[PDB]
């Protein structure tokens, strides 16, 4: 049972999620998550995506995905690779990834300031 989250974070499966507000460019959102002991959200299943679409800002959010090599090798901030994807039609507009209100993903310029950003961290577990 991995379901304990810090105050203000929401649990989904074995992860904790923070739905941040305030205008930030991608790297600023990256540090906002880091300084809260989390990281910009990494998405690995349709169930996780569905949960995020339900809770995320209608005006768009930064997520933890980037074209790290600038040639299409999209990597999550925690170093994990893209298995599950939720790209909008014609995606992958530049090097950082944002999630629209629909939950669908699109490339964006890293220096664009978005009003929303999502953090995740692992839920802590109650010992059996």
Swiss-Prot record:
Binding-site residues, Ca(2+): 91, 106-107
Name assigned to this protein: Low affinity immunoglobulin epsilon Fc receptor soluble form
All copies of domain C-type lectin, residue ranges: 4-121
Species for this entry: Homo sapiens
Disulphide bonds in the chain: 2-125, 5-16, 33-119, 96-110
Protein encoded by which gene: FCER2
């Amino acid at each position: 049972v991995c379901n304990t989250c810090p105050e203000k974070w929401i649990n989904f499966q074995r992860k904790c999620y923070y739905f941040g507000k305030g205008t930030k460019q991608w790297v600023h959102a990256r540090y906002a998550c880091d300084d809260m002991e989390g990281q910009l959200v990494s998405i690995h299943s349709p169930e996780e995506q569905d949960f995020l679409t339900k809770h995320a800002s209608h005006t768009g959010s930064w997520i933890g995905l980037r074209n790290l090599d600038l040639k299409g090798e999209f990597i999550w901030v925690d170093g994990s690779h893209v298995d599950y994807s939720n790209w909008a039609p014609g995606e992958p507009g530049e090097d950082c990834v944002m999630m629209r209100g629909s939950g669908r993903w699109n490339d964006a310029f890293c220096d664009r300031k978005l009003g929303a950003w999502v953090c995740d961290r692992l839920a802590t577990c109650t010992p059996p």
